[PDB]
Symmetry: D2
Subunit: 331 residues, 4 copies
């Protein structure tokens, strides 16, 4: 009912135990170390709570405009929380390496993941397991149950406009590309400067390779096997269609949903980068007790594209054609 | 020892109880409401922990350069935490007023014990559960940062009459400077510009009278316009004059950070009152009128700023050439 | 065509003239003073360009969903620029008061900025080419006026159609009647009395919007700015913000409040910087009138969309809100 | 004297020319594109002005506490400007790719570097530039005039902040053999510390823990060999793994060891701000490449392939970080009790 009881502050504010104080050698900054991590864990619980509710709203055949608005609200809220978590790094960087060295003896390393909740966030978003008892159950369920990556793909596959009997976007798009590149060739052929004519013709050939990568499903499949793409061919067609008509009321919220998924992915990378810089400022690439630089090198490897979930969304503008060449909406 | 046990996550992650879920009318955003407030409370505990350690380092006759550097580090850390707490407001503003309305029935009407402890430990004026009562009493009786900073400022080397005797040299330089301004204003060809400069010199005379006459300073303190003792104000003025000097750079950074903290608390108060109005307007069903909203608006006044004196210091400044040069 | 020519850098990067350097007494921080102000003026030109395009899109009888989306994009863009301009204040605060004192003799007293005044007038703040710009910004419709005209044409308010306002008064009457009966059966006498006094406060709140004479009196007094019908439209939008048809109109109102709030945050940060630099008064200021004027700009008399900030005062729970028909 | 004349607004506010408006096909967002870039260029001029003044204060034999404080103020000011410049990227991301596509035809690619001032900042800090030189539709000059070529040449030949900071670090009081003689006391403390670790590891009851600690002490030995053997340090500098001279690194290490001491607190803050500047430039590069990809993907019509996007991604490597040596300093740290106590 009242503030302190409602928020269970007697339990929350009783979870801070400084081991350097227990051992009669107190390091003042150990309190900061505990609070910073606990604030991260409170916000990780919030992100998991948001992610699970979004996963449940996406696990349905019909996703209406009303539910789409609520998914956008929750994804945007996760973006704000992640921005706040990135800003928590300079607060811990205020602790000197020598002060950290005076209490790191009371800390034990991890045999698997560092944080249970951080791993649950990674798995629920769609971070690849191959591209790397209640707690074991949580990890198993996060690996077996559909991730946001998979659920977003199912939603994109059912994008209205892709059906052959209806708007038939994909065929109209290949048709428009052919006419657009034909017009570019004719315009390039009339270039008075020979150098500019040759450059434009080579550039039109680069566009042809780009369109082959999406219009030939076998080329798309090879990129998925290679790890360059993750989306199914139909999820990519839906995602491309959404970027083309983002100005249209019917596609603005679906587009904002995709934009926010990219923002979340990008903010997780920014957290990883800020964390690895803080780690290096505290203990360098290796220190006494670390057994070499394997911990630091592992953190650096998490900065690769193998860890980005919605890599496909970042490249969508490669396939764009100008407004005048885009197939006009019928309905 | 390991992560989860060291951070006591079994206790920390078991303090979130949604009352709308318990009553089987769940409001999804109630979880955000709990987590946002709990993150504030964790950082309030950190600020109190920092403030108590700074208060202890300041409760000493000698405050050396090494301890000054550590106080500056901890005050700067509090500034970073306050900036993060101001940024937590837009996250809660993401909850709609209608969603909040669906769970506010489970909430009952100081608001936060730790927030009040921060106010008292910093020096927010009282005139302007047994463990909780004890904490409030100790925060009111024990010296606040406002009082301890004043004691530190009073012992500023350079103020003593036997040594550098800054205050007397400063009154002497002001007289010399204002005399030169008068002579320059007397040679102004345009009568209107001469009269403007002469009226302006007269306003400077009143400004300096407010600090060079201790009775005028005392009256301003009684009125609530100033908080500092006359000697703490002399020390603070001296520090701003020589901030570029190595000897005064860290004492100046200490004052700057106290102002930053004061300013950030006001920014939190403003962002909180805007969020409150976005959620329930000036009054709503269950508020009993607009008294709560009006109280929050009154916390935005200068009566709630602790180091009001520090913000006005530049009013007393004279140019570099007129400042008494350091001897030693 | 190429970068430097396209951006006219030969002209842009030749507009920094340090007067302390010209007089052979250089103050290094004078360069920062010039660049900071010039960055503000570049962004003020961008905000005016955005505001003028939004004013033109709002000066139309029909404002469809497609145009509403574009207005939201530009308003959100202005919010991001204002946040950036608030962050430019600590950069200038890095200059010391003594360094500023060494070059402020080359500065003249003076509105301060033409573009800042144009932004205030184009938004709707109630305070020869430059004089013409000021006159046109005062005579031509401000965003405050154009948003009111848009709110007045909110679909749902017409008596022949959805008739929101009448259904809303009807729902309020039934809701407050139910609250009275519930309060009458409160077992604790203290809680019964508190709830009854609280319902009376709600009655006064609803009288302020359901009686047009009470609304008109609040507008004359300065407590409100909106016409009665603009306020009905704004209230309706906040009630149905979860509905796809009202989400973008609501986001438009939200962004107007954000802009208003960010201008106040800039004013507050500017007045703190001013006090850090020259206190409440200094040599050349002729007293504290300049500082007191800046402090008065922090009042609600300077907020344009004050009406939008109070809208949640009129809210009733989801179950009591008239359901959408169409 | 008055606002508009002092700031030369008649000249400043007359530099915005939308080419889509000139061609009678106006794209509203083209105005944003011009202003954003012009705000970057104004702040680049400010950073260059700050960097040149810091370079001049560092190009002296004696750098006193008063000047050290002023250098710290200007480096900190640059950090605030860089943070503001990173925040300018989301403002331009507000322009849709299709709107950008409607005016990119009026833009020409560039012969060499994109911005003269951004290159001057890189060179003045100490960035080691790669190679580039790309084929374009129509050729253009790398330098607009001999004054721009001269600026680039002077920024490459004249001492960068990287070089001047090294000279300052080389003269760190405490390194001289006749005085505090830090380096010898430090090697001596490391020898005793590692000897104590060996004896403690030898008494480990569990064999697995004993072998882990002994293998870990061997890794520490290699770490200390990389700084106590000048030939190993020299090899790392030739390889590109380090940039600092051996004596500059000794001074930087000494400063991190005694950062709590008043005499070393401002020299340490100076190093910290150099790392912050380096880190913020990388953050700008990352945010810029994400915006580029959101606008035109990895390649688009007019780009001639993905070489431009791949070049920008290559600027995110450690080869572009200037003060890489400063980021690793904590690798060499020993506990407080093992650090040689200050004498004087
Ligand atoms: C003094 C500051 C810190 C130090 C020295 C530090 C150190 C490290 C190291 C060495 C690792 C790699 C372990 C290994 O696999 O060998 C790691 C991983 C990790 N740390 Fe930190 N850390 C610090 C602060 C933080 C904070 C504030 C958080 C926030 C919750 C955090 C969360 C994590 C997580 C979640 C991982 C796993 C990363 C992944 O698997 O991709 N650390 N940390
Ligand atoms: C849904 C959002 C919120 C609403 C509606 C709200 C509402 C209110 C109201 C009405 C009061 C005044 C009570 C009275 O004296 O009559 C108040 C005070 C207060 N609230 Fe909130 N609040 C919200 C979020 C927060 C958050 C996120 C915090 C952070 C800890 C917070 C901390 C406080 C504190 C510390 C006070 C006391 C202020 C002072 O005495 O100066 N509130 N709030
Ligand atoms: C060293 C820093 C600054 C000082 C000392 C300063 C001082 C002042 C003073 C004293 C006034 C009031 C003049 C009067 O009416 O008597 C004023 C107004 C104003 N200043 Fe500043 N200022 C500073 C920086 C800035 C910056 C960075 C900007 C950005 C463009 C700015 C923009 C303005 C504007 C637009 C007004 C008019 C405010 C209004 O009418 O509401 N100032 N300033
Ligand atoms: C619509 C947004 C933008 C697009 C599409 C874009 C695109 C590009 C591309 C393709 C390159 C590489 C050129 C090549 O070497 O082949 C580049 C480089 C560069 N751009 Fe942008 N850019 C954008 C905005 C900006 C902004 C806002 C700035 C700020 C001044 C900027 C500054 C630069 C600089 C300095 C480089 C050179 C980077 C380096 O050499 O490391 N760009 N940009
Ligand atoms: O202000 C209090 C609620 C109180 C509170 C209770 C539980 C958790 C957090 C908070 C809170 C935060 N700020 C004020 N309050 C009001 C909020 C409006 C409805 C009646 C109770
Ligand atoms: O394993 C801990 C780090 C671990 C940790 C333990 C306890 C509480 C928090 C954390 C933490 C946060 N990020 C990594 N870790 C070691 C990792 C090697 C350097 C010294 C700390
Ligand atoms: O009137 C000027 C301030 C004015 C100004 C002049 C020239 C360039 C920029 C500015 C400025 C910015 N904000 C207020 N002003 C003040 C600045 C010092 C104290 C009394 C005169
Ligand atoms: O190389 C220029 C982009 C270059 C540029 C030119 C003119 C003005 C600004 C800019 C700019 C900003 N960042 C990169 N560039 C090309 C790159 C994409 C196709 C058409 C513009």
């Amino acid at each position: 009912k009242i503030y302190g009881e409602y928020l269970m502050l007697d339990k929350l504010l009783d979870a801070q135990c400084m081991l350097s104080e227990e051992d009669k050698r107190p390091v003042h900054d150990e309190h900061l170390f505990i609070i910073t991590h606990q604030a991260y864990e409170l916000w990780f619980k919030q992100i998991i709570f948001e992610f699970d509710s979004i996963r449940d709203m996406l696990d349905a055949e019909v996703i209406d405009e009303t539910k789409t608005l609520e998914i956008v609200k929750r994804l945007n809220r996760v973006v704000l929380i992640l921005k706040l978590l990135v800003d928590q790094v300079p607060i811990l960087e205020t602790m000197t390496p020598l002060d950290f060295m005076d209490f790191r003896k009371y800390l034990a390393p991890a045999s698997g993941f560092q944080s249970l909740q951080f791993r649950l966030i990674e798995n629920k978003l769609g971070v690849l397991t191959e591209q790397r008892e209640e707690a074991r159950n949580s990890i198993r369920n996060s690996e077996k149950d559909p991730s946001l990556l998979e659920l977003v793909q199912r939603w994109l596959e059912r994008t209205p406009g892709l059906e052959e009997s209806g708007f038939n976007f994909w065929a109209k798009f290949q048709e428009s590309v052919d006419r657009f590149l034909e017009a570019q060739v004719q315009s390039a052929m009339e270039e008075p400067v020979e150098k500019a004519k040759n450059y434009r013709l080579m550039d039109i050939e680069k566009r042809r390779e780009v369109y082959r990568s999406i219009f030939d499903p076998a080329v798309h499949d090879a990129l998925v096997r290679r790890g360059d793409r993750r989306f199914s061919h139909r999820a990519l067609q839906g995602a491309i269609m959404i970027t083309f008509y983002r100005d249209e009321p019917r596609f603005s919220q679906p587009h904002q949903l995709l934009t926010l998924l990219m923002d979340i992915d990008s903010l997780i990378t920014k957290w990883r980068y800020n964390h690895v810089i803080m780690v290096q400022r505290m203990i360098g690439s290796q220190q006494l007790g670390t057994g070499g630089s394997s911990g630091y090198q592992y953190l650096r490897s998490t900065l690769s594209d193998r860890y980005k979930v919605f890599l496909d969304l970042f490249n969508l503008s490669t396939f764009l054609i100008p407004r005048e060449a885009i197939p006009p909406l019928d309905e």
